[PDB]
Design a protein around this ligand. Structure first.
Ligand SMILES: [Mg+2]
Ligand SMILES: [Mg+2]
Ligand SMILES: [Mg+2]
Ligand SMILES: [Mg+2]
Ligand SMILES: [Mg+2]
Ligand SMILES: [Mg+2]
Ligand SMILES: [Mg+2]
Ligand SMILES: [Mg+2]
Ligand SMILES: [Mg+2]
Ligand SMILES: [Mg+2]
Ligand SMILES: [Mg+2]
Ligand SMILES: [Mg+2]
Ligand SMILES: [Mg+2]
Ligand SMILES: [Mg+2]
Ligand SMILES: [Mg+2]
Lengths: 123, 111, 82, 80, 150, 205, 129
RNA sequence: CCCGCAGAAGAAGCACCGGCUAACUCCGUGCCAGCAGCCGCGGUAAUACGGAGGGUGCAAGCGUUAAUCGGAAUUACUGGGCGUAAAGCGCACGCAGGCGGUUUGUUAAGUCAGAUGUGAAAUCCCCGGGCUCAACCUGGGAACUGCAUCUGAUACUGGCAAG
RNA sequence: UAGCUAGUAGGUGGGGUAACGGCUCACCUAGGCGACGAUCCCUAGCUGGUCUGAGAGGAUGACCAGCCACACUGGAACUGA
């Protein structure tokens, strides 16, 4: 409040920690994705959701949600991981990119081809 | 990839052959990796199943040593040398680096 | 050695030279003492395009500056009274 | 005469050497509060002159030691 | 010359012995085009009943606001409940740029230029009345000639 | 850089005639004005306070056929100019070359005016201009070249051009097939139904 | 406490205007009189007066036109804890020019309008609305 | 760059449509499969999922993610609080530090005025000019809120003297 | 991170640098810096500016341009303005 106090100790600012612990100024990353489990959602909802524990290239073990209906993802064949936070499973700060590197796109999808890596059908 | 996984039509193997061994291979020449792997699948048996992961075009690399870090495997090459960045990873974590001049000495030891 | 010389700051396929007093050891577009004028070798038939102050350069020639082949041509193109 | 500041003696005897702590008033860039800044500067001097409890005039010169680029000229009064 | 509109409508619960009954509360602001700003709140069990009562109360309690041409006469501050309101004149420039709740009271008053920027509480019910108190305390350079001049 | 789809769908969505249906016959008759903008467009016309600001942005853009990025540069240019920003917005749009071609009556529609300017038929002060976005200033003469002169496309437009308002700020001429832009149009000479205070608000946030 | 006696006077006005008291008394000074002269110059207050010898006592007659107060507000701008100094065109105008501020210049205590015409500024004291 | 030839020929996709937020129905699925930036949707009338139709926004881009600021008066100098929501040390004496009643003289540090030097050019901004326009380029001016010195003013603050 | 400094602070004399100088020696004195943040630790080229913002600020140092530093790592000298 008093300006003489502010001269001794100036105004502090919060660091504002990011929601993507990978960091490195990277929009996307890749990782090994060793094991793919099926964990139940939070309290309000009820489902079985496809989730994978992605070992990143930098050396951090993390988890990531798999969007789209069904997948071939398991064991080996390194895939792209864009990130971004959506809240369903306990502690899931990332999302996998469908239709990139070795990750299959969503089959028979027509709307929203940009998301999920679906190519335009010839007509 | 989808067929081989769905082919079993069951959540697991019907018997106890589930125990398997993983290998990592990078050969300097492109002609070998496709050719010798076929011979490497000949030694495969029902009891113990062996599979190749991430066949390389040559040498060795960071993502290759990382590939052997996630799943325990032997890292072998028909002909390869260790990179400066490759030695740091292999020496730190516990792994095995073995290069073989001939395919016969390789086909024997994997067995 | 201070030198009066033309530095190119204009554009790709459309040159615009900046006559300027600078040391020979510095770069073309790099360091300089101060600006004197400008020269466009595209332009058109009009009142402006070529401008060069003789009061500025003639001082530096007295102080021991050299004149390049371009600046020698541009002084004898525009002349003094003409 | 060359420019001079209104600093005081503060330390007594450095064996033919003297320091000058210089008080001023300066505006703080952000808040605008006035804080008294103290600029201690080493000064060269002759014939072990008067010490603490004085205000001394100062001027620029060549350095006769490490730092110490100033010289004194006149001192006001005697007692503190 | 009537120039009438509504800002927003809000549902409110009573929760009696039987069960929850839901009323509707509107907010309207009106003006003649040059000064004379006025407002009305009201409530009703239906939506078109609530807005009709709001416009009914909006006619009475209408007070003069002093304008030079089509703008405010100075930058003025006003406070109501938890809403702190600053504003700038900005003479005949770009103009009438503002967000909802406070957009209605400015445009119907006659001003085509002044900048809103509402600090503190941005509640639709309390952002109105903060403006009119700010407009009321403002005074004209012609009619302050009692204190001004001699 | 152009729409290419149905022009009347743009007019039906706004609920006002944009003068893309000027051509030979005019004043609609066959319309279905508003009432079914889409399949479920017969739904009630109540619309948000944010949406009416965006609606007026489209009303101005769809007349002249300007894209949002190209239109943002004219708003950015209108802001830096002196006086009212809203009045200078429509002035810079009215200063376009293809719009001046439409006002004088060389092109029948505003889309046809850009179409004719694209093929380098229009010359200003002697020199040819391809770009429809060319800025027209006072005392700048404009005319059609010797090639493609007195054709049925341009001739039919100039005949029916007399039936419209006939703007005061420029001379129609049409005798020797030329034109002259005298001065910048006034606030009374344009706008009226389209509003400048509505369109400008959306870029403030 | 009595550290800022100029800010005391600015408090005495709004207490006087709110309470509807005509005559308000206080201890006088050099700068204290000159600020009260600027209030009468523009014509906010009715008239100033002083009575004493060893103890000067400033008596400010407060003006009332309507039931509402003449002076809308008054705030301590430059205070001992934090001072405000403005050059020539950096002097802030109060309410788009309507009313006047109090500014202490080298020649004397003047208004915001008058100090611009002189061509020199100084320490602003308070904004009289 | 200009002229000639042929012929609408070679060239429109992308997101989104429960509210926020511009733009809605049907069908399939039935807490299953999935969406999600936030509040949340789906357990048999889903404008929130998937497809289709229609529509909206934008355009050789579109969308998602990542990074910075704004919004955020949510570190608040300008421009916020501390009875009960986060927040007044349990209380007091006190050095350094911050601030100081009232009268006169002096000093001119702070402050304010004027002038000089400097604040590279480019950039930003304003009025023009040149690439078919624009981006881009460029003439001149303004500006670079700063700092130092010199010459002045003495109200206020500070130093000093007498009260 | 609250105490940190022996060439450390100052003088005299000699030597040294193109040039002032603990720059480097012998001797003498016991100071120097520091709560207005010394020292230590972590991080980072800096500025004209760019980006955002009504402004004040915040973030940032790509290209363009100035200065400094570095030239496989560490250290040293020669030639020469
Ligand atoms: Mg484009
Ligand atoms: Mg909508
Ligand atoms: Mg979707
Ligand atoms: Mg259904
Ligand atoms: Mg802030
Ligand atoms: Mg608060
Ligand atoms: Mg409490
Ligand atoms: Mg410059
Ligand atoms: Mg031009
Ligand atoms: Mg005094
Ligand atoms: Mg010596
Ligand atoms: Mg570094
Ligand atoms: Mg702000
Ligand atoms: Mg070296
Ligand atoms: Mg040498």
């Amino acid at each position: 409040a008093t300006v003489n106090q502010l001269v001794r100790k100036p105004r502090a600012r919060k660091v504002a920690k990011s929601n993507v612990p990978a960091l490195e100024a990277c929009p996307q990353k890749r990782g090994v994705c060793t094991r793919v489990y099926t964990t139940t959602p939070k309290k309000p909802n009820s489902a079985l959701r496809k989730v994978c524990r992605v070992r990143l290239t930098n050396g951090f073990e993390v988890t990531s949600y798999i969007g789209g209906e069904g997948h071939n993802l398991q064991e080996h064949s390194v895939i792209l991981i864009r990130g971004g936070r959506v809240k369903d499973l306990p502690g899931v700060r990332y999302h996998t990119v469908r239709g990139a590197l070795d990750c299959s796109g969503v089959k028979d999808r027509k709307q929203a081809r940009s998301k999920y890596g679906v190519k335009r059908p010839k007509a | 990839q989808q067929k081989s996984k769905l082919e079993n039509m069951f959540a697991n193997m019907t018997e106890g052959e589930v125990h398997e061994v993983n290998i990592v291979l990078k050969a300097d020449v492109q002609g070998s990796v496709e050719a010798i792997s076929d011979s490497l699948l000949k030694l495969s048996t029902d009891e113990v199943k062996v599979k190749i992961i991430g066949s390389g075009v040559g040498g060795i690399t960071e993502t290759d040593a990382t590939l052997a870090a996630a799943s325990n495997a032997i890292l072998v090459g028909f002909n390869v040398r260790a990179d400066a960045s490759a030695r740091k990873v292999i020496e730190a974590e516990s792994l095995d680096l073995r290069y073989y001049s001939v395919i016969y000495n390789l086909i024997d030891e994997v067995k | 050695m201070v030198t009066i010389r033309l530095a190119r700051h204009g554009a790709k396929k459309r040159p615009f030279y900046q006559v300027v007093v600078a040391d020979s050891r510095n770069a073309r577009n790099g360091r300089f003492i101060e600006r004197v004028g400008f020269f466009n070798p595209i332009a058109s038939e009009k009142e402006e395009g070529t401008r060069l102050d003789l009061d500025r350069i003639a001082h530096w020639v007295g102080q021991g500056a050299t004149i390049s082949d371009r600046v020698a041509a541009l002084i004898k193109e525009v002349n003094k009274a003409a | 005469k060359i420019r001079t500041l209104q600093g005081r003696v503060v330390s007594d005897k450095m064996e033919k050497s003297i320091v000058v702590a210089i008080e001023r008033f300066v505006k703080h860039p952000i808040y605008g509060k006035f804080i008294k800044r103290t600029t201690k500067l080493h000064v060269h001097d002759e014939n072990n002159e008067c010490g603490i409890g004085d205000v001394v005039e100062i001027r620029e010169c060549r350095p006769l030691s490490k730092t110490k680029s100033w010289t004194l000229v006149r001192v006001v009064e005697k007692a503190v | 010359e009537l120039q009438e509109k509504l800002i927003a409508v809000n549902r409110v619960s009573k929760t009696v012995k039987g069960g929850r009954i839901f009323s509707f509360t509107a907010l309207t602001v009106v003006g003649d085009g040059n000064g004379r700003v006025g407002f009305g709140y009201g409530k009703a069990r239906e939506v078109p009943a609530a807005i009709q009562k709001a416009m009914e109360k909006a006619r009475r309690n209408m007070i003069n606001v002093a304008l030079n041409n089509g703008t405010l006469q100075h930058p003025v501050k006003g406070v109501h409940t938890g809403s702190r309101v600053f504003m700038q004149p900005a003479s005949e420039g770009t103009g009438i740029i503002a967000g909802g709740a406070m957009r209605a009271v400015l445009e119907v008053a006659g001003v085509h230029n002044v900048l809103a920027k509402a600090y503190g509480s941005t509640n639709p019910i309390n952002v109105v009345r903060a403006t009119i108190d700010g407009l009321e305390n403002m005074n004209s350079p012609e009619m302050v000639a009692a204190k001004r001049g001699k | 850089a152009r729409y290419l789809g149905p022009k009347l769908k743009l007019s039906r969505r706004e609920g006002t005639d944009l003068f893309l249906k000027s051509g030979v016959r005019a004043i609609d008759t066959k319309c279905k004005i508003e009432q079914a903008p889409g399949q479920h467009g017969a739904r009630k016309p109540r619309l948000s306070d944010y949406g009416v600001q965006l609606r007026e942005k489209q009303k101005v853009r769809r007349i002249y056929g300007v894209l949002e990025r190209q239109f943002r540069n004219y708003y950015k240019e209108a802001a830096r100019l002196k006086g009212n920003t809203g009045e200078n917005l429509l002035a810079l749009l009215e200063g376009r070359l293809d719009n001046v071609v439409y006002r004088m009556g060389f092109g029948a529609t505003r889309a046809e005016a850009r179409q004719l300017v694209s093929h380098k038929a229009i010359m200003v002060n002697g020199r040819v201009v391809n770009i429809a976005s060319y800025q027209v200033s006072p005392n700048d003469v404009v005319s059609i070249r010797e090639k493609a002169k007195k054709q049925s496309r341009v001739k039919a437009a100039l005949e029916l051009a007399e039936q419209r308002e006939k703007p005061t700020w420029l001379e129609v001429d049409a005798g020797k097939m030329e034109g002259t832009f005298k001065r910048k149009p006034e606030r009374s000479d344009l706008s009226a139904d389209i509003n400048e205070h509505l369109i400008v608000e959306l870029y403030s946030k | 406490s009595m550290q800022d006696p100029i800010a005391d006077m600015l408090t005495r006005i709004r207490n006087g205007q709110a309470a509807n008291k005509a005559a308000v008394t206080m201890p006088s000074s050099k700068l204290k009189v000159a600020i009260a002269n600027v209030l009468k110059e523009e014509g906010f207050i009715e008239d100033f007066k002083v009575e004493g010898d060893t103890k000067p006592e400033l008596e400010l007659t407060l003006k009332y036109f309507q039931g509402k107060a003449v002076v809308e507000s008054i705030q301590r701008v430059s205070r001992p804890g934090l001072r405000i100094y403005k050059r020539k065109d950096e002097l802030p105008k109060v309410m788009a020019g309507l009313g006047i501020a109090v500014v202490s210049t080298s020649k004397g205590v003047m208004t915001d309008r008058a100090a611009r015409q002189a061509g020199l500024g100084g320490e602003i004291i308070c904004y009289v609305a």
